[PDB]
């Protein structure tokens, strides 16, 4: 169909590469494609250069190299392996005593490689590393809350690379320094730097009472060496103040470019703020035998000058996005790399003080175990290493662009409050104001803005066009937040004639504050409205019409869209749905120009101009992390002529290259007999008939057969006491055959385990003797289908020990994996939503004959209740429906950009053209106006909808332009007493499906210590009847119901056993006994040496252990 | 000390705290018999106190005792007793329970105020002991053991078993709960109406007291077992007998949304 695009905004630059924040970050850290001599000192290289040389003997670093991966990505996912490269390092051993030189390349283990789309494979599972927002290193000055006229100067370095410093000025008048939460007068440290009373007087003095208030005579009565010993006694009481020891502590804490690291951004921020230039990343130096200051005096100078009110001195806003920076994957991993390297160095110094100071090479001196563990530890247990969200292509693309303020080196979930969660004025163009979690994490986890990119220092920059005079150039400037605040920036929609600003008054921002300004004052201009929002938010058409709280749900829920077999792109798009499929990498494109040689279900072969016959295999039915089917389908035919970058195969949830998260359905907005109540949704059985909202899902089942002290577990088709009916679909070896339908209770893989010393009780012995069947040596442990699961067996993987390429964890003979697939039709309880935040559960599926229908016989698809609109204030769905109506009859789809979109008059023009097809057809087909259409028209003029005194055609068109039509109730045939809004809406089936959530338990697994039911569906858990539920039962006074919850239905063991026996015998359940978790409590108080005694009315003890615990 | 599935061992932190204690006591007994100087005997004695301190309340005084190569403080007896995760507020004032289930809720306009839609598959598990007895009284299985064996495989379930379940639940109620339970109406009693399908059907009038939507809410189900529990539920906890707020005294089950709109 034709695609009509609205909007006048010409976007001078395309969206940047969307995963670049990931791909570019790690490439920068590894520099694997850089020749070692050409590596810059950054990332991994910088980490090595920092740890070495290791002094005693000296072990020095030459260079590192990265090998090729031992196994490809597909193989790693298959075998539950990490996708990684071997790391080697060239080291030269030197002898400071001798002259001896031995050089060798030591193996440091493997390092994980990032895939093409910006993710990782760690033990077979795909993972994402989320960027972390935090405070930029530097020197900040904030107002002191206690004293309204004084300030605290805080010197903050990179995390874990030094202490926090506070320079509070105490009430006594002397300037105090705070380090590791301990305070002393700052003057003493100044003396250690070699400063004299003259310097402080001559440098500052201008401030009458402050410079003199720092002056303390007793400190001056000693040369720089004596003052250093004096301070050390303050910081480490009881440690002998040996002169080499004091120097060592102070050097390592302040001046050591190994133990103290300001950022590279810290250096720039410090240099820029204090107007000095730093020779390095440390607060001081050790030069020519004494300490020489760098930072401290300028920080003191700025503080005093600020207290007075000297021009050029300001406090810093700590939530400003100039003083807040992003830590990306390379930086996060490199920090952990630096930790592992330092641990390995501990082993080196310790090994260089033992086994002979001569017969040692670098290979024996280095143990790589500490390094491998630190890297393996980060990629498997960090709280920035997350299970990939790959529900649909947008899920993972969004996941990679997320920003967390949580994690190792950031706030706790308890340790966080409003200032940080706020939307800062500087978030404009950088962090999306919409896409954030609702609930406890609000404002901490956010999403990178669409046009934003993170610079080398870690600050987010956003693009603007230069405006010189009144002419707008095509030169784009990416600005940090601090640099943006300097200029006056006009809005992107401000009128233009050609390249000239066409308005006398323009809408602009100066430091985020909106201001009206003349074109002479305009320095820059926004690139686009898209630059303000995340990628998910940019997919919501008519966003300018949606209340933000609902727009949020629209964004977040697109993440949850399940790939549909019939998936289609929305009829109203924003124009970003093309870019998302391409950057996601789900879809397949042509490398060069060429001709399609072959097209298959499994593969596509292309003959290019080069003559090379490149073959592109297609991924078919692969199971994602969330169990949605990732599957690619061929879009070209044999012999099709393709140009460079043209589509070859569609990925999942994509249709001809446009993002398809759902389906386009014909919707009627109206209550329906209470099946619409409180956001529930009514659907036509026609949707299932034509397989709309059907999606494929695969669950993986796994079982190990291992060696035990009682003998081997064996995976076998021979399982004790089972009929052949119970085994039919199992192969020779005991594995279910590929292409079988399996249902709950069915055997997937047969397995036997050797019976314990429970070697049958005499009760079983006598029974076994009667039937004349020996009690078997093995018991039936077979893997079965869980309750509520099942499908078609599409695959089996079997891995034994002693087969090429496989070694399992010790003791495990063999592992069998069964992949089971299911086609899921939409059903009652599955959840639907649109892009505006209207979301609901399917409450009713009507047969087509009950559905409200148009006069010409077409039934509607979805019936949505209007009561969801007015309180929610999400109106984009309404305009979306109307334009959807026009497109339904005109046969077209639209691109309506956000904030530069289809507007009301234009939608009206289109709606009129549609009416002609809906009506003119009828008049020519030989039908006039219906009797019921008149009845509705009567009611409509009473409503002021149509003008009285016009032909029925004129009035129906008047309604059709209001997006309303006549609707007949399929039950009665009588019309709805009013004209109803009807049109095409884009609605997605979300990942929350009843099939997954329905659960029930009579009895089941219990916990070890408490003897209470386990939790969770996978464990066959019981529901938690918690503290608040008990209150409810208490307020009702239901004592026996509550007691049942507290005894027979939980840990009262005698009672729960006895109650079950009663129900199966038809007797009533017995009165409960003492709950076992109370006995646990008693013994636990005894373990704390407290005597807990149950007493009767005579104050005599009652034994709740029934004699078992007394000798 | 338990062997998990894989043959691996999983163990309580208390064992490591006791082991530390036992070692230091034993070494102290040995150092005393061997007549070590007072400085050495003193160090051993103070280490012994600290070991006792970690066992009873770890972290209370001094550095928390940790397992090697982990930052996790070991869990001592005080930690076991106290806190949100402690013995009292987890296993004592509240518990997980048998005879309970959960699913997504869906609106049921056709229900009478005292009714709910209950998926048939959920009902069979919740009443499973009752269903076995009834399957013996009539005739679907020879005895209780064979009846249970038949429900294990879903294809072995014949259609008479569903009618059998209908006889079981006659006149009985179940409890519906939707979290958070802010006041006593987060739980109400309903007579279940068996339904095909995986969703719980909730009566429209009670959605307010429950603060329920159909935006995807789920609810928990509970089965009162005894005659006493059933009596308490049907009389005291039944939705139809609680129509007015205990807080304001005003009507709680009252028209809203479409109902008001229609009238």
């Amino acid at each position: 169909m034709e695609i009509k695009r609205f909007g006048r905004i010409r976007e001078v630059i395309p969206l940047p590469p969307l995963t670049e924040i990931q791909v570019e970050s790690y490439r920068r850290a590894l520099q694997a494609d850089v020749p070692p001599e050409k590596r810059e000192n950054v990332g991994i290289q910088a980490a090595f250069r920092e740890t070495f040389p290791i002094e005693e003997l000296v072990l020095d670093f030459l260079e590192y190299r990265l090998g090729e991966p031992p196994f490809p990505q597909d193989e790693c996912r298959e075998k539950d392996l990490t996708y990684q490269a071997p790391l080697y390092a060239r080291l030269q051993l030197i002898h400071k005593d001798t002259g001896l030189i031995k050089e060798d390349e030591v193996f440091l283990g493997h390092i994980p490689l990032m895939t093409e789309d910006g993710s990782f494979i760690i033990n077979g599972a795909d993972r994402v590393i989320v960027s972390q927002i935090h405070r930029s290193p530097g020197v900040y000055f904030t107002p002191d809350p206690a004293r309204p006229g004084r300030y605290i100067a805080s010197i903050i370095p990179l995390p874990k690379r030094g202490p926090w410093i506070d320079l509070e000025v105490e009430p006594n008048g002397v300037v105090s320094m705070k380090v590791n939460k301990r305070k002393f007068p700052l003057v003493l440290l100044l003396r250690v730097l070699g400063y004299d009373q003259e310097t402080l007087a001559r440098e500052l003095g201008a401030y009458g009472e402050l410079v003199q208030g720092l002056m303390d005579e007793s400190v001056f009565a000693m040369r720089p060496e004596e003052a250093l010993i004096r301070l050390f006694t303050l910081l480490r009481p009881g440690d002998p103040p040996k002169r080499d020891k004091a120097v060592a502590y102070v050097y390592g804490l302040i001046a050591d470019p190994r133990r103290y690291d300001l950022g590279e951004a810290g250096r720039y921020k410090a240099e820029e703020k204090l107007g000095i230039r730093l020779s390095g990343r440390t607060l001081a130096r050790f030069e020519d035998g004494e300490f020489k200051d760098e930072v401290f005096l300028p920080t003191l100078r700025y503080l005093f000058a600020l207290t007075a009110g000297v021009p050029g001195h300001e406090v810093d806003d700590i939530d400003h996005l100039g003083n807040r920076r992003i830590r990306t994957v390379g930086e996060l991993m490199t920090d952990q790399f630096r930790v592992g390297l330092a641990r390995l160095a501990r082993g080196v110094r310790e090994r260089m003080l033992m086994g002979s100071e001569d017969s040692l090479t670098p290979a024996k001196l280095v143990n790589s175990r500490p390094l491998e563990a630190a890297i393996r530890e980060f990629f498997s247990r960090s709280q920035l290493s997350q299970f990939k969200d790959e529900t649909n292509p947008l899920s993972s693309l969004r996941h990679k662009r997320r920003i967390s303020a949580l994690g190792p080196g950031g706030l706790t979930r308890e340790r966080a409050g409003f200032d940080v969660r706020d939307v800062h004025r500087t978030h404009y163009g950088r962090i999306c104001p919409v896409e954030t979690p609702e609930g406890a994490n609000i404002g901490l986890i956010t999403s990178l803005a669409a046009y934003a990119r993170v610079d080398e220092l870690g600050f987010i920059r956003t693009p603007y066009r230069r405006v010189v005079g009144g002419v707008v150039t095509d030169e784009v400037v990416y600005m940090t937040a601090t640099e943006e605040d300097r200029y006056t920036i006009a809005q992107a929609n401000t009128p233009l004639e050609g390249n000239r600003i066409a308005a006398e008054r323009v809408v602009a921002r100066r430091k985020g504050e909106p201001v009206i300004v003349s074109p002479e004052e305009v320095e820059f201009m926004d690139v686009s409205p898209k630059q303000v929002f995340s990628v998910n938010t940019n997919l919501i058409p008519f966003l300018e019409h949606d209340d933000a709280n609902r727009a949020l749900m629209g964004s977040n829920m697109q993440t949850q869209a399940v790939p549909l077999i019939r998936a289609q792109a929305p009829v109203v798009m924003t124009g970003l749905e093309e870019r998302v499929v391409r950057d996601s990498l789900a879809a397949l494109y042509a490398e060069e120009d060429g001709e399609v040689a072959k097209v298959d279900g499994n593969r596509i072969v292309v003959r290019y101009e080069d003559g090379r016959l490149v073959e592109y295999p297609l991924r078919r039915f692969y199971r994602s992390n969330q169990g949605t089917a990732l599957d690619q389908r061929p879009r070209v035919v044999v012999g099709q002529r393709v140009r460079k970058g043209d589509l070859l195969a569609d990925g999942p949830a994509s249709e001809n290259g446009f993002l398809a998260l759902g389906q386009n359905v014909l919707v009627a907005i109206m209550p329906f007999d209470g099946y619409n109540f409180e956001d529930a949704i009514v659907i036509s059985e026609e949707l299932l008939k034509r397989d709309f909202y059907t999606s494929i899902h695969i669950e993986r089942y796994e079982i190990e057969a291992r060696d035990t002290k009682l003998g081997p577990e064996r995976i076998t088709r021979d399982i004790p006491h089972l009929s052949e009916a119970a085994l039919r679909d199992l192969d020779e070896e005991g594995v279910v055959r590929i292409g079988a339908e399996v249902k709950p209770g069915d055997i997937l893989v047969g397995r036997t385990s050797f019976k314990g010393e429970s070697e049958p009780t005499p009760e079983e012995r006598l029974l076994r003797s009667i039937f004349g069947e020996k009690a078997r040596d093995v018991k039936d442990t077979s893997l079965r289908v869980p309750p509520g699961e099942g499908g078609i067996v599409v695959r089996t993987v079997r891995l034994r020990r002693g087969d090429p390429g496989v070694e399992l964890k010790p003791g495990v003979r063999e592992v069998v994996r069964v992949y089971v697939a299911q086609k899921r039709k939409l059903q009652v309880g599955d959840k639907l939503a649109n892009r505006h935040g209207n979301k609901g559960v399917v409450a009713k599926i009507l047969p087509v004959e009950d559905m409200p229908h148009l006069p010409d016989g077409t039934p509607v698809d979805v019936i949505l209740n209007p009561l969801g609109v007015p309180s929610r204030m999400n109106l984009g769905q309404i305009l979306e429906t109307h334009l959807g109506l026009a497109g339904y009859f005109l046969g077209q789809r639209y691109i309506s950009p956000i904030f530069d979109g289809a507007k009301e008059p234009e939608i009206k023009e289109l709606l009129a053209q549609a009416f002609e097809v809906y009506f003119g057809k009828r008049k020519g087909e030989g039908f006039g106006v219906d009797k019921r259409e008149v009845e509705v028209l009567r009611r409509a003029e009473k409503l002021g909808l149509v003008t009285p005194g016009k032909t029925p055609e004129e009035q129906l068109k008047e309604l059709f332009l209001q997006g309303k039509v006549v609707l007949y109730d399929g039950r009665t045939g009588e019309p709805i007493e009013g004209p109803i809004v009807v049109g095409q809406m884009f609605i997605m089936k979300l990942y929350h499906m009843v099939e997954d959530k329905m659960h029930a338990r009579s009895t089941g697994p219990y916990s070890l210590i408490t003897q209470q039911p386990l939790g969770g569906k996978a464990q066959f858990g019981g529901q938690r009847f918690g503290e608040m539920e008990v209150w409810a039962l208490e307020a009702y006074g239901a004592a026996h119901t509550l007691q049942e919850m507290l005894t027979l239905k939980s840990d009262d063991i005698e009672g729960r056993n006895a109650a079950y026996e009663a129900i199966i015998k038809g007797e009533d359940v017995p009165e409960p006994s003492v709950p076992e978790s109370f006995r646990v409590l008693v013994k636990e108080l005894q373990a704390l040496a407290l005597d807990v005694q149950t007493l009767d009315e005579k104050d005599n003890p009652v034994d709740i252990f029934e004699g078992l615990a007394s000798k | 000390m338990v062997q998990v599935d894989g043959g691996r061992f999983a163990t309580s932190d208390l064992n490591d705290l006791y082991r530390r204690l036992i070692n230091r006591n034993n070494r102290l007994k040995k150092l005393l018999a061997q007549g070590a100087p007072e400085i050495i005997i003193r160090n051993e004695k103070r280490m012994l106190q600290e070991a006792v301190d970690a066992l009873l309340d770890n972290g209370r005084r001094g550095a928390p005792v940790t397992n090697p190569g982990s930052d996790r403080p070991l869990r001592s007896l005080t930690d076991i007793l106290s806190g949100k995760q402690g013995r009292f507020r987890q296993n004592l004032l509240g518990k997980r329970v048998d005879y309970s289930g959960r699913s997504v809720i869906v609106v049921g306009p056709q229900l009478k105020l005292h009714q709910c839609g209950l998926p048939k598959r959920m009902a069979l598990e919740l009443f499973k002991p009752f269903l076995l007895k009834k399957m013996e009284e009539k005739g679907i299985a020879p005895n209780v053991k064979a009846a249970r064996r038949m429900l294990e495989r879903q294809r072995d379930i014949k259609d008479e078993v569903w009618d059998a379940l209908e006889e079981v639940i006659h006149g009985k109620v179940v409890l519906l709960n939707r979290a958070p339970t802010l006041h006593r109406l987060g739980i109400q009693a309903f007579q279940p109406v068996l339904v095909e399908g995986q969703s719980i059907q909730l009566h429209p009038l009670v959605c307010e007291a429950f603060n329920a939507d159909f935006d995807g809410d789920q609810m928990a189900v509970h089965v009162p077992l005894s005659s006493f529990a059933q009596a308490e539920a049907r009389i005291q906890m039944l939705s139809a007998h609680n129509l007015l707020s205990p807080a304001s005294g005003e009507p709680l089950a009252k028209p809203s949304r479409d109902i008001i709109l229609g009238l």
């Binding site: 009881g238 440690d239 | 160090n43 103070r46 280490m47 600290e50 001094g62």
Partner: peptide, 8 residues
């Protein structure tokens, strides 16, 4: 307050 420091 630090058992190592005391012993040293």
């Amino acid at each position: 307050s630090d058992p190592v420091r005391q012993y040293l």
